Symmetry: C4
Subunit: 95 residues, 4 copies
Amino acid sequence: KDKEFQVLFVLTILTLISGTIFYSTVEGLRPIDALYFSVVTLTTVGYGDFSPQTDFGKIFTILYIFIGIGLVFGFIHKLAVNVQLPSILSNLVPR
Amino acid sequence: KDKEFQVLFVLTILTLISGTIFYSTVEGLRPIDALYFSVVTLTTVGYGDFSPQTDFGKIFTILYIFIGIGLVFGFIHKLAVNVQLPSILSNLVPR
Amino acid sequence: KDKEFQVLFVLTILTLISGTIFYSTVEGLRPIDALYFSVVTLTTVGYGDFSPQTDFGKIFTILYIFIGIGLVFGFIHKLAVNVQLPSILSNLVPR
Amino acid sequence: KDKEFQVLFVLTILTLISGTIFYSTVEGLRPIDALYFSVVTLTTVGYGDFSPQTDFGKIFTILYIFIGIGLVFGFIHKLAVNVQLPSILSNLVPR
Ligand SMILES: [K+]
Ligand SMILES: [K+]
Ligand SMILES: [K+]
Ligand SMILES: [K+]
């Protein structure tokens, strides 16, 4: 239900926090930029305004992408179908 | 039906208008560039020829991506299967 | 069958040719670069080593993305399940 | 089963090795950077911190994308549903 969505939501934020912590400390980004970069990476947008410069960070980025894309897109999907779609249908009821 | 497609179409344009308004005013882009950037972002292409420079804009971009990807890809999917696919089948009928 | 795959294949190449023609003439790219850019765009990789510089090209790029992503990913999907998957299963048979 | 996952895993690494070999030798990247670039490309992130500079490499990149995206996203999907999802459910059992 909503708890399915809530758990995915929590997993997704924890995953984004891990990236924030990693890119803040290993790659020297401000926490806000490391969060923003983590999001841009796992949603596969990839502006490239930020990207890892160290070998450690490139290796982490490889694993982070493979492990986090599946979760992040699972969350977007549940966001879309269990939250945005009901809300839309609700907003379409005429009164 | 077609109204399902029409509603998604309207929601998608309204979402792209929101990004146009936000990136035009907060990030200083020409309206055309803010529209183009919004599209490039939510379809996950992400050239990076444009990207947010302010902290406010990076935070908005985080939320805009998570909220808009699901809708935009729902629309592309309905575009593909309820409009392009029938039109293709129609264009394959021999006479 | 295979003709389903063949038609999608033809549609996809015709779509990539349209982008090649457009970006070669309107954006001044070498045909090879315009083809490469069209592919990078519709598969949503978006390196940004190329991106449209004119207003005409940005507008075309908006429409090209929305119209071409659905087809290109339909083709990759049929490539994956009707061609690569059988070939893999075939290559797994022990003799 | 797990062997389905194991085979996809092997195919995916072999595909990433092919890109590593190609971009290391034809494009002159360090092996680590060619591996990192191959991953960033086939998951469709596409930072553009690296991108092919030679005509040979752009042509290979076209084919590599079309052939490798389907496999890489098949693997992420099986990673997500046959490995991460069971592990999550397991980690949710109360004791
Ligand atoms: K991308
Ligand atoms: K980029
Ligand atoms: K992408
Ligand atoms: K990109």
